[PDB]
Amino acid sequence: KKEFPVNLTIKKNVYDSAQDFNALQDVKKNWSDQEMLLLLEGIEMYEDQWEKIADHVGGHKRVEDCIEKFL
Amino acid sequence: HKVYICHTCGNESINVRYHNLRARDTNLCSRCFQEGHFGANFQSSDFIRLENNGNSVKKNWSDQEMLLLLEGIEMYEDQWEKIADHVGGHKRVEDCIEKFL
Amino acid sequence: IMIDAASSFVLPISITKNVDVLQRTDEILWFRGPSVIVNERIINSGDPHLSLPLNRNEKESLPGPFVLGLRPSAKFTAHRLSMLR
Amino acid sequence: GDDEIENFRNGTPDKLVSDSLLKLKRLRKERILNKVLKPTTEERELYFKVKRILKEVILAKKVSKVPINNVRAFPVLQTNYNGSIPVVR
Amino acid sequence: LQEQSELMSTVMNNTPTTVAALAAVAAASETNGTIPKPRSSAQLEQLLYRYRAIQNHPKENKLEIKAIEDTFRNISRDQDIYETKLDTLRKSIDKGFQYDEDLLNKHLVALQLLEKDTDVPDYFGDPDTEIRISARISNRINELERLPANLGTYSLDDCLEFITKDDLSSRMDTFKIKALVELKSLKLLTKQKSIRQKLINNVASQAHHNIPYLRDSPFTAAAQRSVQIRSKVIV
Amino acid sequence: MDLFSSIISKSNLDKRPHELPNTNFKINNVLPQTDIENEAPRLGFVGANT
Amino acid sequence: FETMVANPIKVSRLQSNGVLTIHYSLANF
Ligand SMILES: [Zn+2]
DSSP states (O other): OOOOOOOOOTOOOOOOSSSSOTSSSOOOOOOOOOHHHHHHHHHHHOOSSSHHHHHHHTSSOHHHHHHHHHO | OOOOOOOOOBBBOOOOOEEEEESSSSOOOOOHHTTTTTTTTOOOOSSEEEOOOSSSSSSSOOOOHHHHHHHHHHHHHHHHHHHHHTTSSSOOHHHHHHHHH | SSSSOOOOOESSSSSTTOOOSSSSSSOOOOEEOOOOOOOBBOOOOOOOTSOOOOOOOOOOSSSGGGGGGGOOOOHHHHHHHHHHO | OOOOHHHHTSOOHHHHHHHHHHHHHHHHHHHTTTOOOOEEEEEEEEHHHHHHHHHHHHHTTOOOOOOOOOOOOOOOBBOOOOSOOOOOO | OOHHHHHHHHHTTTOOOTTGOOOOOOTTTTTTTTOOOOOOOSSTTTTHHHHHHHHHTTSOOOHHHHHHHHHHHHHHHHHHHHHHHHHHHHSSSOOOOOOOOHHHHHHHHHHHHHTTTTOOOOOOOTTTTHHHHHHHHHHHHHTTTTTBBBOHHHHHTGGGGOOOOOOTTTTTTTTHHHHHHHHHHHHHHHHHHHHHHHHHHTTTTTTTSTTTTTTTSHHHHHHHHTTTTTOOOOO | OOOOOOOOOOOOOHHHHHHHSSSSSSOOOOOOOOSSOOOOBTTTTOOOOO | SSOOOOOEOOOOOOHHHOBBBOTTTSSSO
């Protein structure tokens, strides 16, 4: 079946509008692009162990906040 | 296979052109885009990296071809020969109309 | 405001003896303005060096421009080269 | 706060999640059919209350898969610069 | 009159001590209709932080400090209540549930689709409802037309290309093309409508010479035969 | 007309003396421009109706 | 050297866009 693709990555969040990526927006909870790339980088390799990822990001991010981001 | 004369010089683009979105009928090489030889009116945001190579087996419709089809429809409003060559000339009229519908 | 100016020029004398490093036509291309050197293409949009939060005269000599440019770490690149073969 | 999740954590965790997502879907239909654009303060408040619960199980239970599916890209700004050849009038 | 945007305007104009919103009953209470308990995560709270940190110098011209401090007390109290409830909530967990996988899939996909305002399938005329469609398309057009033009990707597959200081990777534009296919396909809608009209009103306009089971019926053949009767010549 | 050239691909570790195919050439240094990117326009500017 | 007017390279917009690269369609002898 042919469907128009649901392009979620472009779509800005409605309910919170503070968990978007940094380009679509106009310890520390800032989440710069380097820790974001390290987060996708750790999720591609380590596959949900939440503690090797939690210092592969660089230690400023709690495991709770990494789960908050992954959701 | 067409040929893409690089604007602002006379060179031939090898396999990657940089299409402009406000003059809409110009291109560039990679080296003229890395250094900024495209005039002070444009701003290096309105240049999309397009390819020149022949793509895969037909009825795939990569996003480059969809974008160039919609550029053609905004250009000409008719004249499906002038749409099908602007897609790249390796698609027929009778398939561009079957894909826009 | 015109668009179709030439903005590249060629001198008639063939000086093509020590010129294999410049940009040749295939002569030498001579433009109407200089080049533009851009350090890094991708901005790093967070990073309180650049974001400037509103909380809390100081200098910092950061290593290189490579902090501001989203470079991947090497363990992922070795993991992906292991996934290569 | 929580004010209910303490009481419902004693039994199953998952029934409230579906019973809240159906309410989100009904409120979204009621926002589409009313020409309103901003979400209400009643489902925003009810949104995070969902996202909390799905967090805590991942904090607590360590469910056997927790699947990973990402687009393996993310949008970043890139530098722009004007051309260096001057304008011709 | 958006006092929670007036504080932001006074902050971003870098001159907030020079006006200080003229906190009396005539001005600081006319925009409030206490302060209305800010909504954001920190974007309306750091403004209150800076606003109190600037209003520590006058300290008597602004009578609205006390309601702001009462809301700080409310925020601290709610935070302490949530920390106690999170301490109890991690103690109220059963030792065994074994949460199912193929419903965790559906809850994750459903939450993700309900975040960014798209329709979720269940698996658990009339120009009233014509405008309610044509007002969701203007939403998407005036949401896509506020993206920055310098939008670019960084996939996880550029590590295999070894991009130098200036090398121009070949997957940088896999989102900006996709963010123009939508924005120009949602403007060429009333062109494909006008092509579909010319298609259907020339396929259905024959309907009795191409379709075989209609041009073989008794009544259609009799009508097409009877329209072709040449008029009788008198004498 | 007062022309300019392309960037020489001479490396930063070359250390050779500067040769010149013409003595009517001159040489200049290009300072790279670097700052917070000037706010680019929105996509409504790039690709409006013509 | 200062009397050496340079040659403009003109692009001619229709050449820049879509030029392809006739007896080789055998219908015309
Ligand atoms: Zn060129």
